[PDB]
Design a protein around this ligand. Sequence first.
Ligand SMILES: COc1ccc2[nH]cc(CN(C)C)c2c1
Ligand SMILES: [Cl-]
Ligand SMILES: [Cl-]
Ligand SMILES: [Cl-]
Ligand SMILES: [Cl-]
Ligand SMILES: [Cl-]
Ligand SMILES: [Cl-]
Ligand SMILES: [Mg+2]
Length: 347
Amino acid sequence: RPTFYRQELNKTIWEVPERYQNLSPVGSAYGSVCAAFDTKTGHRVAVKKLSRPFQSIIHAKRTYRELRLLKHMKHENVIGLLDVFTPARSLEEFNDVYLVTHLMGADLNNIVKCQKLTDDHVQFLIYQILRGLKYIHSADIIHRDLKPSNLAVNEDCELKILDFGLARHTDDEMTGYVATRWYRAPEIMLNWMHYNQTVDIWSVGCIMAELLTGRTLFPGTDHIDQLKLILRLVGTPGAELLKKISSESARNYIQSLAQMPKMNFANVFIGANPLAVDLLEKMLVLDSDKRITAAQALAHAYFAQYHDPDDEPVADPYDQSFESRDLLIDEWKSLTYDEVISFVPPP
Ligand SMILES: COc1ccc2[nH]cc(CN(C)C)c2c1
Ligand SMILES: [Cl-]
Ligand SMILES: [Cl-]
Ligand SMILES: [Cl-]
Ligand SMILES: [Cl-]
Ligand SMILES: [Cl-]
Ligand SMILES: [Cl-]
Ligand SMILES: [Mg+2]
């Protein structure tokens, strides 16, 4: 066990191993975050102290879910876990959880608004998102919250996916003129049906379009305005997709709208690479069963310069059976403790 030291920073007590030095607050409902220098590895890191990790059954299970997910992710284009610790010496006094990751600087928002991107930049950025998604989807994980602020980018255009959706976002958070909804697939925005990993490909399409034009693709002022923007581009649904919408009321609302054909994407994305236009038509399909997958998209000709089928790995199997399990607070807490003390750091 390492030696810990205590200190109060912005009305919060931080008790961390000596290896972490020069802590400095950098943001704060999930927890508080500090930047630090890790003397063992030489990296600048983010140290997150979870807020009230075991206050309810829902909160205790969310804590376990986040720790299991971060411990599993081992891929160049996905954020991974550098360390996890608690100052507790026993399960009986276990109360605080700290997560350590690489410190991220710029996100894709900064780049999209402040840089002139060549077509080569768009190829490399979207390639890396799809490479990470092939890995994530191979373990039957759905990200659910892909958007520019959840993609970290450095000066060499290298990219990592972060901030997996832990089923956290509230009704108030998705209301009105907000980027938290502009990247969501319509079937999840309006609860049309049980969703699957195809919702992430819809998000990549929205992100790719914004890199090409400099503008948000579907900036709706509310759920209904956003649906109207979507259907004007991709067309209103046919009878085949209507069959798949479980809500009879949602089916009724859809059929209330006048029918519209799919638009010509070359006249929307004026001047873009014809291979980029072709890929966007295959991502932004209304029926989720018919969207291109991440593995299929990596082999698309738009990525000819970067695609290497021997360097696009898949994930180890990921057991999610705990999600359907019913446990008490102290049982979720004990499972979390076990995962903290069994952590083994990367090479
Ligand atoms: C600083 O932000 C990033 C974003 C993507 C990245 N890909 C590789 C690195 C550097 N690594 C030491 C974390 C990186 C940093
Ligand atoms: Cl230490
Ligand atoms: Cl990482
Ligand atoms: Cl503790
Ligand atoms: Cl965003
Ligand atoms: Cl009509
Ligand atoms: Cl597993
Ligand atoms: Mg985020």
